[PDB]
Each structure stands twice: as C-alpha cells, then as structure tokens.
Amino acid sequence: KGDKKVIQHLNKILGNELIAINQYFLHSRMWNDWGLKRLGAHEYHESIDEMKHADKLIERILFLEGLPNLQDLGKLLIGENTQEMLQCDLNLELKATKDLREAIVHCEQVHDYVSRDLLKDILESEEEHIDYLETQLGLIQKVGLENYLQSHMHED
Amino acid sequence: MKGDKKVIQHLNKILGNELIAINQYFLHSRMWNDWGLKRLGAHEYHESIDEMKHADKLIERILFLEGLPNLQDLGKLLIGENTQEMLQCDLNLELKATKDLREAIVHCEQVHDYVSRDLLKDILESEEEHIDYLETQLGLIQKVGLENYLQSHMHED
Amino acid sequence: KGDKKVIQHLNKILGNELIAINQYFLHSRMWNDWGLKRLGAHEYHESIDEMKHADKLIERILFLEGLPNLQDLGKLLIGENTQEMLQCDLNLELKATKDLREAIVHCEQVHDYVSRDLLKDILESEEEHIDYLETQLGLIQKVGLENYLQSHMHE
Amino acid sequence: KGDKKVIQHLNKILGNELIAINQYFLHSRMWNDWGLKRLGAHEYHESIDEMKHADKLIERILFLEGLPNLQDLGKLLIGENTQEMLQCDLNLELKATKDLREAIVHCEQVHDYVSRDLLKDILESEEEHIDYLETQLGLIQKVGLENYLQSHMHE
Amino acid sequence: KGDKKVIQHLNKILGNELIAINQYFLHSRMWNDWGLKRLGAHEYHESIDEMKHADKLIERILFLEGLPNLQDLGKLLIGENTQEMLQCDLNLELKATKDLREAIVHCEQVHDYVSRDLLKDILESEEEHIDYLETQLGLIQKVGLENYLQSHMHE
Amino acid sequence: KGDKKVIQHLNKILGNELIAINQYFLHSRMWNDWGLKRLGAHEYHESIDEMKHADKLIERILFLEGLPNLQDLGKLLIGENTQEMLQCDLNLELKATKDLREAIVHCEQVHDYVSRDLLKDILESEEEHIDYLETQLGLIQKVGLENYLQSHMHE
Amino acid sequence: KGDKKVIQHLNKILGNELIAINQYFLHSRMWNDWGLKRLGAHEYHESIDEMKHADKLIERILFLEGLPNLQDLGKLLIGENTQEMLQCDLNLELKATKDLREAIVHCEQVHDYVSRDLLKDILESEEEHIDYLETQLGLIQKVGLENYLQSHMHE
Numbered sequence A: 001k002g003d004k005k006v007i008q009h010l011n012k013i014l015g016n017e018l019i020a021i022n023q024y025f026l027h028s029r030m031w032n033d034w035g036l037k038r039l040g041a042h043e044y045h046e047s048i049d050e051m052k053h054a055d056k057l058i059e060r061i062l063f064l065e066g067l068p069n070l071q072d073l074g075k076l077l078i079g080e081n082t083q084e085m086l087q088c089d090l091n092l093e094l095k096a097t098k099d100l101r102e103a104i105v106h107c108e109q110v111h112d113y114v115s116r117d118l119l120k121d122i123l124e125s126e127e128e129h130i131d132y133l134e135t136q137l138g139l140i141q142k143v144g145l146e147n148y149l150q151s152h153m154h155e156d
Numbered sequence B: 001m002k003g004d005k006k007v008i009q010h011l012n013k014i015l016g017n018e019l020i021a022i023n024q025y026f027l028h029s030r031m032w033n034d035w036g037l038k039r040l041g042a043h044e045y046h047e048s049i050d051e052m053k054h055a056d057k058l059i060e061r062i063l064f065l066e067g068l069p070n071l072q073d074l075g076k077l078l079i080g081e082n083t084q085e086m087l088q089c090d091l092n093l094e095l096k097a098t099k100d101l102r103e104a105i106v107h108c109e110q111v112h113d114y115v116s117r118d119l120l121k122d123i124l125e126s127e128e129e130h131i132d133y134l135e136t137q138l139g140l141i142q143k144v145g146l147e148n149y150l151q152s153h154m155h156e157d
Numbered sequence C, D, E, F, G: 001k002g003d004k005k006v007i008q009h010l011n012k013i014l015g016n017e018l019i020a021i022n023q024y025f026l027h028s029r030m031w032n033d034w035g036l037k038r039l040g041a042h043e044y045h046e047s048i049d050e051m052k053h054a055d056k057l058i059e060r061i062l063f064l065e066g067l068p069n070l071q072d073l074g075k076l077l078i079g080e081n082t083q084e085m086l087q088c089d090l091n092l093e094l095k096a097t098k099d100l101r102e103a104i105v106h107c108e109q110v111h112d113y114v115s116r117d118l119l120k121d122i123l124e125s126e127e128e129h130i131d132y133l134e135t136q137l138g139l140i141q142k143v144g145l146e147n148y149l150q151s152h153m154h155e
C-alpha cells in the first residue's frame, strides 16, 4: 500500500533519528558527569525530541505497511569536550536535514502528501536545533569558553 | 582510573542488552498498536520505557567509574510476526538478560563493587518481574484461547 | 466459664476457619500467579473474611475461659485448576456449614444465646459463599470455561 | 525455573511465618482478654507483619514454580503470662533469624539474588522485632513487672 | 395482647435494669467523689446503657399491652471501695444474665421471637459488661491495686 | 550479641564519620566566612548526612550489644583554600570507602546481612560524595578557579 | 582581629560543647536502646542544642580571625544507668558553666561585648539544663526510680 521508496526514505530518516537519540543521550550524560547540568538537561531534551520523531516515523512506516528498521545503527559522533560535542551534533543535524529534503522531494513526486507533512514537521524541529547548536558555538566565541561553561554549570 | 575494568565491561554488556530490549519492545508495542491491540501496545510501551530508565542508570554508573558507555553496538533484535511469537521473543531476550546479570553480580561481589552489585540487583528484580508477566501471558493464551486473549487486549485500561 | 462442649464446638468451627484461611489464601495467590486477577482478588477477600471470623471465635473462646486451639490444622483442599479450586472451596464450605448447624443446636440447648448469635452470623456469611461458589460453577457451564476465565483476567 | 533447595528454604521460612502468625495472634487476643490493650495492639501488628511476609514468600515460591506449603504447622510457643509470652516470641524469632541466614547463604551460592533480597528484608524486620522483644524484657527489669504491665493497659 | 408470662419476665428484666441504673450511677459518682475520674466516667456510661435497655423494655411491654413496673426497686449492691464496687456490679450482672436466659427460653417456647431478639441484644451487652468487670478485677491482681487506681485517676 | 569483629568494624566506620562530621562542618563555616555561600550550604548538608550515618551506626552497635566509641577522634584534614578543602574531603572519602568495603566483606563472612545492608547504603552515599568532589575539582579546571568561586558566592 | 585570649576562651567553650554533643548523643541513643524513649528524645534535643551553640562559637571565632579547634575532644562522661547518666551530664554542665563565667570576665575586660553577649546566651541555656538535670534527679527521689523510669518509657 505505501510506495516502496517512500518507505526506504522513512527508514533512512528513522535511522538518522536512532543515531541522534543515542548520541544526544550520551552527550547529555557526559555533561552531567562533568557537572555541566544545564547542558546536560538541554541535551537530554533534544534526545527525547528525537525519540518522539522516531515514534512518529515508526507509526507511519507501519501504516504504509512497511517494516520499520530499528536494527541498523549508524555511526555515533561522540565529542571529547563541550566544543566538539556541539560541533558533532551540528554535523549530525546537517546530514539529517539533507536526507529530509531528499525524502520530501520524493513524497511530493508520488503524492504522499501526509508523509511529506510529517517530514516537514521534523525538518522544522531539526532546523531549530541547528539554530541552537550554531548559537551555542557563537556564544563560545563571544563570551569565551570558560564563561560559556560556567553559565551551564547550574540548571535552569 | 577508579572503576574495575571487568566491572565496566559487565556494565556495558548489560547496557547492550538494555539497548536491544528498548528497540525490540518499542517496535512490538507499535506493531500491537498498528493491529488495534491497544492494551498490549500500551503495556509493551511501558516495558520499553523501563528499559530506557535502566540504560540511563547503567550509563551514569559506567561514567562515574570512568569507563566509556557503549551505545554504538546494537545486537540482534528478536522481532516476532504475531502476538504469540512477539511475547516469546521478549521472553527469550529476558532469559539471556537475566543470565548476564547474574554473571555481572558475581564479579561485582568478587572485586567489592557493592554499589554496582546493588544497581544490577534492582534491574534483575525488575527483569524477573517481566519474565513473570511474559510467562503469565503465554499461559493465559492457553487457558482462555488465543482469540479471547487477543480480544481482552483490543481496548486499553 | 462456658459450657465445655460449647467451647469444643467453638474450637471446631475455628479449626474449619483456620483451614479456609490458608486454602483460600493459596488459591488466591495461585490465581494471581496465573494472571487471573479478578479471581485472585475475590479469593483474597474470602480469606480475609475467614480471618475475621477466626478472630471473633478466638475472642469468645477466651471470654468463655477456654483455650483457643490454633495449633491443629486440618487438611487443605488444594485444586490444580480453576474448576477444581472452586469445587474444593465448595466442599470445604459444605462441611463448615454442617459443623455450624451442629454447634448452634448445642448452644441453644445450654442457653448460650450469644455464642449461638455469633455462629449464626458466620453461617450466613458461609451460605453467601456457597452461593457465590455454586454460581461460579454454573457460569462456567453457561458461558464456557475459556469465557469464564477470560472474564476474570483483569481486576 | 527455581532452584529446588531455594524452594525448600523458602518453604521453611514460610513455615516459620505460619507459626509466628498464629502464635502472635493468640498472644495478642490473650493480652486483650486481660485488658493489656497496648500489648494486645502491638502484638496484633506483629502478627499482621508476619502475614505480609508469608504472602511475599508464597508469591516468590509460586513464581519459581514450587508449591507453597501451608499445610504443615509447627509448634506454637504459647506463654501463660506476659514475661513468658515475650520470651516465647523471642525464642521463636531467634530460630527464625537463624533459618533466614542459612537460606540467604544458599540463595547467594546459586545466584538467586532476588530471593536473597526478599529474605534480607524479612531479616531486617525480624531483627527489629528481636530488639522490641529484648527491650520489653529489660523494661520489665528496670521499671518492675507491675509498672510495666500498668503502662500497657491503655492503648 | 402479649403472653402473660412474657410480660412478667420483661418486667423482671426491667426491675434488674432499674437496680443497675441506680447502682452504677451511685458507683460512678462515688468514683468521681474520690477523684478516680476514669472509673467514674466508665461507670456513668454503664449506667446510661442500662437506662437505654430499660427504655426498650418499657416500650415492648407497652406494645404487648402489659403494664410496666417502675415502682418496685430491688436491692442495690453498693460497695465501699473500688474492689468491692466492681465485685458488686459483677454479682448483679451474674444474676441479670441468669434471669435473661430464663426469659428467652420462655419467649422461644411461646413463639415471641421479637421479644427474644430484644433480650438477646441486652444479654450480649450484659456479657460485654461481665467481661469488663472480670478484666478489671484481673488487672488489680496483675498491676497492684495502687497502680490500678492511679491508672483511673485521669480521664 | 553481635560478632566481635563486626562491632569493631562498625566502630571503625563510626570513627570515620566523626572525623567527616567535624571536617565538613568546619569547611562549611570557612566557606561562609569567605562569602562562598553555596559551597558553605552544600558542605553543611554533607556534614549533616554524616551525622545521620553516625546515628545509624550508633543504633546498630548498641543493638548488637557493643559500646559505641565517640571518644577517639581521628585526624581532621583541614584545607586552607577551596581547592585544598575539596581535595582533603576527597582524601577522607577515599579512606572511608576503603574501610566500608573491608567491613562489608567481614559482615558477609559471618552472615550479618543487616549490618552489611546498612554499610552498603552508607557506601552508596559516600560514592555519590566522591562524584560531587571529583566533579567540582574538574569544574575548577574547565571554568577556571575565579569563575568556579564566583559561581558559588550566592546560594 | 580578635583578642588572642578571647579566641582561646571561645575555643575552650567550643571544646566543652564538642564533648557535650557526643556525650548527650550517646546517652540519648542508650536511652532509646533500653526503651526509655522520652529520656532519649529529651537527650537528643539537648545534644542538638549543643550543636547549635558550637556553630555560633565557630562562626564567631572565624569572624575574629581565629582557627576553630574541632580536633581536640576531651573526655566523655558516659554513665551506665539512668541515674549515673544524668549525674554525668550535670558534672559536665557544672564545668562548662564555670568556664563560661571565666570567658565572660575576660571578654568584658577587653571590651568584646558581642562575644560576651553570645556567651551569656549559651550560659543561660546551660543553666536551664542544670535545672532540668537537678529536677530529674530530685524526681527520682520523690517518685522512686521505677516510677521515674516508667514515666519515661513512652514519648
């Protein structure tokens, strides 16, 4: 019933969300470990958001009578300090966003407009995340790394 | 520096088992929902959430002990194709998890990591509760027949 | 001081309650084990009711100056499946109820009208239990074993 | 699923709990009969606690695929006055505690860590009871028997 | 029209209530006089309860078309210290309870089941009071009279 | 009666807690003096936590019929600046935690599973304390000492 | 900077409070162990009060640029029964109170009127403590030791 390449696209986006869930979750727990609790909580909330996207992808694939793939897990990008963690998340999101545009082009072409609408809602969320990530990296330049980390020791 | 290395390897192994379980239970949940078996869908969803909570505690402990949590390696999901197989797959998964937990606890005891032991014991209790639930559902399928069992799980509450 | 045979009757009724406590408590936990939670909860309340009747019997025996006998525990009738368990409970209650009638006769004869009244209240409760049991057995015939068990999975 | 000697240990601890349930329940009603209502209420809660321990044991045994034994009831130690009743409870709890330790040794050996944990929680609660018991007997010595009883007349 | 001998029995139980009202009332105010206020309050409440039994007997006699007798007051057993006051109440209750069993035999025999039920409720109450009285006498022995009285100074 | 070596081990853990109580309290008060109020409040909570541990140890020793030793006070590790204070706290907890492991091995050996459980709960809280301390020292490196102290001026 | 001798005196009072904290805490816990819960609770409150005094002394020393001494712990006076425990507490407070007077004279002399005021507040609370202690010892004589202990069993 679903278009076969729409389902391949939905699984591919799903594969991206599955990487992100784990990467964000680890980076969150690394920040907590280091006592940078505000970064930790924020990253924890990014990880939950990716879990909610994966749910919606999984529900759609199953309705389209595809088989969701949660077995393949691509490469986690894990940073070694706060700057690299944030850059690692940004590299993940730039790739996820590219795959999202490509999935949407194809849904349009086979008139799977509901799948298209779902991917656009994810894409808007991923662009907000890009903005958060770029912004954090800019603040590191503007206030200095030590100040930036200080401002993230204590939770909101 | 602080953690025993084999404790860490044990913890990453349990964590690996939790990560399979998260994905397996989450897909079985959504498969059950897709079929309109909503009470099963919701119960399996809560099993998946509980495994996510246990992964979180293991990750925090690994990191305290100065090890590196492994979330990169995902072992084999046991995906069933109908209700009876999905339950059995979950049970086969738990029986392996539970064996692994016992071996870890043995080792924690040996090297005096009594806090890690205690965490693993709480997870074990919780996995043994799951085994009870799983075995009970399979026994009920026998006692009330599959059609009734499935009917009793169409609606939530 | 109570009539000595009244006390022996009170101790016999208590002996029956003590069997029922343990038999119903085990049947309750067997049903919970099997995922038949409504049967398990009902059977648990029947066990608690037998505990309360044992308590009244103990209090009365002590007031009458007798020795409550909590030591001798008779035979538990344990079933291996739902129909057997309900039938065992019924067999137990049919025996308890005969003992209650015999005891009441004796309290009447020696003018122990308070013990009689106490035993009549337990008898009413036991007859309502017989009714519940006979009814479950009937429902099993009417709706079929698998339906009947299905109806007792969720609390 | 269960290890067979784990199950025998669980049934033995269960057996000890069945004795304590009855012994404390009777001691409770005996204190009440005498108008020592505060000892009565205390002992009633000790009995209820042992009922909850038995429940947890039954459920564990059934999950491990054993047969809970509620049929065998060992010897109740019943005292004839307050000093002896407290000593009988203490002697019962010293033996309980010893069996709980041997059972935990065995769970540990065959890696039944959940059964071990359950028995350790029971043990903590039996050691609290030993403390209450030892303490009442020391109070009998410190304040005198008549005072001690007087302090236990009113709830 | 009631049975004649039913009515005679009801008026007899009523005379026992009228003695008891006045004896418990006086014992209460003697206790209050001495500053044993807990005994005084408890005894007040026993007196009020006898008043309520008397009222039920009066109503029933009048419904059966008899004449209630409140003129013939029997012998009050008034003690001169706590121990005697309590034994007096208990001597009065043993008699009351015996007259009660007789009335009930007679009601059974002429089929006055409602009068019988009324007398049985009173008998249960009178047996509770026997329990209280025997308990108190027991306590004086176990805790010593001085302690027993001290425990009844404050309400 | 407890095992003699368990009481020595409990007394040794107690000894460690008595040192920590005083060392944490003084560091707390030194932080408040310098106007580093958040550090002062955190450290006061740590000192309070050790006071609670000490209390449980004391209750347990006495139950076991031992004599709690509150007389021997070991050596306080008092730093003179924030970095040294934190490291002295960590040096203390490293020793405390080693001693707790050795106690727990002995308790397991002689089957004192309640003592073991108590010590394990204290160990888990001491380990959480080590985490806090290692984390703050690391934050000093990541944010710089001046920013780290500034972040602990206000509560 | 405070006067050097005032800091020595504050450190000496502090020293007394550290002894009292531990001595009162242990007596508290010994009373709870024996089931004299009211004495145990009162004594715990006394130990807490000394902890608050110690805190104020510590804050004041540091303000005055001195070094609080929490390392030297003088000699605990631990009794072995209730009467001795009370007298050991009074023996402690008699010394503490003498030392506080000598401190206050010195503070007055060098014009440290805030220190003096702090010490006077501690002296008033130590004097209230002496009153409590002398009162309990007198009550032991007036009511007898058995009644006195009985009056302190329940909180």
Ligand code: HEM
Pocket (backbone or CB within 6 Å): A018, A021, A022, A025, A048, A051, A052, A054, A055, B019, B022, B023, B026, B049, B052, B053, B055, B056, B071
């Ligand atoms: C590293 C693997 C994962 C970890 C460590 C993890 C952890 C967590 C935690 C701690 C929570 C909050 C649980 C609570 O306390 O209520 C949560 C929620 C949730 N998770 Fe995961 N999770 C993981 C993977 C997944 C995956 C693969 C999915 C795929 C569907 C998923 C779906 C969800 C959903 C839907 C929620 C509820 C979110 C909400 O609405 O609040 N999670 N997870």
Ligand code: HEM
Pocket (backbone or CB within 6 Å): C018, C021, C022, C025, C048, C051, C052, C054, C055, D018, D021, D022, D025, D048, D051, D052, D054, D055, D070
């Ligand atoms: C196999 C032996 C027994 C078991 C397993 C058992 C189990 C239980 C349980 C689980 C409860 C509820 C307690 C709570 O959580 O609050 C209870 C209550 C109680 N039991 Fe038992 N019980 C047993 C025997 C007895 C016996 C022999 C007596 C005799 C008097 C008794 C008298 C009572 C009473 C009066 C209550 C409170 C009932 C109420 O709610 O009014 N029990 N029991």
Ligand code: HEM
Pocket (backbone or CB within 6 Å): F018, F021, F022, F025, F048, F051, F052, F054, F055, G018, G021, G022, G025, G048, G051, G052, G054, G055, G070
């Ligand atoms: C220099 C030594 C000590 C200092 C400065 C100190 C100070 C304090 C303070 C200020 C409090 C809070 C009191 C309140 O606000 O009501 C407290 C509470 C407490 N202290 Fe200590 N104390 C000391 C020694 C001890 C010791 C040796 C013990 C051993 C048992 C102890 C046991 C406790 C307990 C159980 C509490 C109540 C904690 C709670 O809230 O649960 N104290 N202490």
Ligand SMILES: [K+]
Pocket (backbone or CB within 6 Å): A147, A150, F147, F150
């Ligand atoms: K700054």
Ligand SMILES: [K+]
Pocket (backbone or CB within 6 Å): D147, D150, E147, E150, G147, G150
């Ligand atoms: K007295």
